[PDB]
Amino acid sequence: TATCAMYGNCGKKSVFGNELPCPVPRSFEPPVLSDETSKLLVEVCGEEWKEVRYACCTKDQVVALRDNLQKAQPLISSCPACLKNFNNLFCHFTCAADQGRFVNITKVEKSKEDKDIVAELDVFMNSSWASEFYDSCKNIKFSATNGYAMDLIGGGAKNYSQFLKFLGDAKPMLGGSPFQINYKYDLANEEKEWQEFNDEVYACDDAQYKCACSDCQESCPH
Ligand SMILES: *[C@@H]1O[C@H](CO)[C@@H](O[C@@H]2O[C@H](CO)[C@@H](O[C@@H]3O[C@H](CO[C@H]4O[C@H](CO[C@H]5O[C@H](CO)[C@@H](O)[C@H](O)[C@@H]5O)[C@@H](O)[C@H](O[C@H]5O[C@H](CO)[C@@H](O)[C@H](O)[C@@H]5O)[C@@H]4O)[C@@H](O)[C@H](O[C@H]4O[C@H](CO)[C@@H](O)[C@H](O)[C@@H]4O[C@H]4O[C@H](CO)[C@@H](O)[C@H](O)[C@@H]4O[C@H]4O[C@H](CO)[C@@H](O)[C@H](O)[C@@H]4O)[C@@H]3O)[C@H](O)[C@H]2NC(C)=O)[C@H](O)[C@H]1NC(C)=O
Ligand SMILES: *[C@@H]1O[C@H](CO)[C@@H](O[C@@H]2O[C@H](CO)[C@@H](O[C@@H]3O[C@H](CO[C@H]4O[C@H](CO[C@H]5O[C@H](CO)[C@@H](O)[C@H](O)[C@@H]5O)[C@@H](O)[C@H](O[C@H]5O[C@H](CO)[C@@H](O)[C@H](O)[C@@H]5O[C@H]5O[C@H](CO)[C@@H](O)[C@H](O)[C@@H]5O)[C@@H]4O)[C@@H](O)[C@H](O)[C@@H]3O)[C@H](O)[C@H]2NC(C)=O)[C@H](O)[C@H]1NC(C)=O
Ligand SMILES: *[C@@H]1O[C@H](CO)[C@@H](O[C@@H]2O[C@H](CO)[C@@H](O[C@@H]3O[C@H](CO[C@H]4O[C@H](CO)[C@@H](O)[C@H](O)[C@@H]4O)[C@@H](O)[C@H](O)[C@@H]3O)[C@H](O)[C@H]2NC(C)=O)[C@H](O)[C@H]1NC(C)=O
Ligand SMILES: CC(C)CCC[C@@H](C)[C@H]1CC[C@H]2[C@@H]3CC=C4C[C@@H](O)CC[C@]4(C)[C@H]3CC[C@]12C
Ligand SMILES: [Zn+2]
Ligand SMILES: [Zn+2]
Ligand SMILES: [Zn+2]
Ligand SMILES: [Zn+2]
């Protein structure tokens, strides 16, 4: 059914860190989602996951995904198109049934439980999707303190590659990624066993997820 790059967690790498995911082979098929995990996955990732029965994530992985998304949510919550694109990226990265085809584990280490945990991985990204994703978040204004939201979730990223690099770089102490995540844009077309991440993307002037003119340039009148 589903092909995963990782499933579950195999312990922590430090006494104060958090547990890290277990690399699984390509022939591994995850079990059916529990009722508890399925209901929680819908609350965190939206109604798109109601009919999903096989996912590449456990309940603990969804809870870790929820805790980290809720820390960055208030920074981009004013722009629904960015929030929708933002959550959609990390939800497929964690739970999509085709995770094993766009996530390539490249480096592992041993945990305190003496098991292999992810240390560094590659995510094959579709340039057009990452470009439109950055275009929907680059102009969000943090209210009151008159700043840019991209200065926090992106560290002041000037293009989409610097945006995903800020999101993927290992920042465990700063509430970021517990391990190194590299976004690759040069996946060869000859590689048929791999594929690039590509989903529906929403611009900040989209009708269903329109953002204010203060946060979206294309939503402003002329
Ligand atoms: C979004 O915006 C960002 C920001 O602008 C863009 O990111 C930049 O993208 C460009 C273009 O892709 C990259 O340029 C290449 O740089 C490498 C070396 O990178 C070093 O220098 C960068 C400059 O540093 C400045 O800032 C840093 C802080 O970042 C600061 O510390 C420093 O003081 C300075 O002020 C560094 O940023 C870079 O950091 C590394 O680590 C980063 C963190 O992980 C990483 O993100 C970076 O990507 C980088 O890896 C690093 O210190 C150059 O080698 C390369 O030039 C080669 O390629 C071109 C094109 O073919 C060619 O013209 C050159 O000749 C050169 O090719 C020679 O060198 C190759 C490497 O040795 C070798 O393989 C070749 O064979 C060739 O060697 C032959 O010729 C030479 C003579 O040229 C000869 O001596 C040899 O013997 C041999 O015969 C590029 O210039 C930037 O690195 C990158 N920066 C960052 C921060 O990402 C991004 O592209 C934008 N994206 C979009 C979608 O728009
Ligand atoms: C998804 O992620 C995967 C990683 O999890 C990616 O897999 C990696 O893919 C790359 C290419 O895309 C592979 O690189 C090739 O590796 C070949 C094997 O290298 C071995 O032999 C080299 C030459 O030796 C020849 O002769 C001897 C004796 O007859 C034979 O036994 C050999 O088979 C070969 O015919 C040798 O140079 C190499 O040693 C190190 O140096 C190379 C080049 O710099 C590096 O590839 C690497 O650093 C090698 O280190 C390896 O061994 C050391 C200890 O020796 C360990 O750290 C570790 O085990 C490391 O693997 C090595 O002995 C080579 O012939 C080719 O020229 C390419 O270099 C990677 O091997 C492969 N990693 C794997 C399978 O684990 C995958 O690409 C990625 N997918 C996508 C789509 O991105
Ligand atoms: C990265 O993301 C890109 C953006 O989503 C992907 O680009 C898409 O790629 C698909 C497949 O190649 C394209 O769909 C094709 O469109 C052409 C266009 O033909 C037009 O004219 C014919 C003739 O009448 C008509 O029948 C078509 O409907 C079109 O009107 C078609 O010929 C194909 O049959 C097919 O429908 C998308 O158009 C394209 N979207 C873009 C560029 O925005 C890209 O594939 C992704 N790459 C990777 C590696 O994942
Ligand atoms: C720099 C700060 C703002 C980070 C912004 C992006 C946040 C929301 C992203 C970046 C990398 C992401 C993590 C990458 C990998 C995993 C492992 C998985 O098993 C559970 C989700 C979890 C733990 C993700 C949670 C969300 C996360 C932390
Ligand atoms: Zn149905
Ligand atoms: Zn989706
Ligand atoms: Zn591409
Ligand atoms: Zn690296």
Numbering used by the authors: 20 to 241
Authors' description from the paper:
In eukaryotes, integration of sterols into the vacuolar/lysosomal membrane is critically dependent on the Niemann–Pick type C (NPC) system. The system consists of an integral membrane protein, called NCR1 in yeast, and NPC2, a luminal soluble protein that transfers sterols to the N-terminal domain (NTD) of NCR1 before membrane integration. NCR1 and hNPC1 share the same structural fold: an N-terminal domain (NTD), a middle-luminal domain, and a C-terminal domain found on the luminal side of the vacuolar/lysosomal membrane. The current transport model for the NPC system postulates that NPC2 binds sterols in the lumen and loads them into the NTD, which transfers the sterol to a tunnel that is formed by the middle-luminal domain and C-terminal domain of hNPC1 and NCR1, respectively.
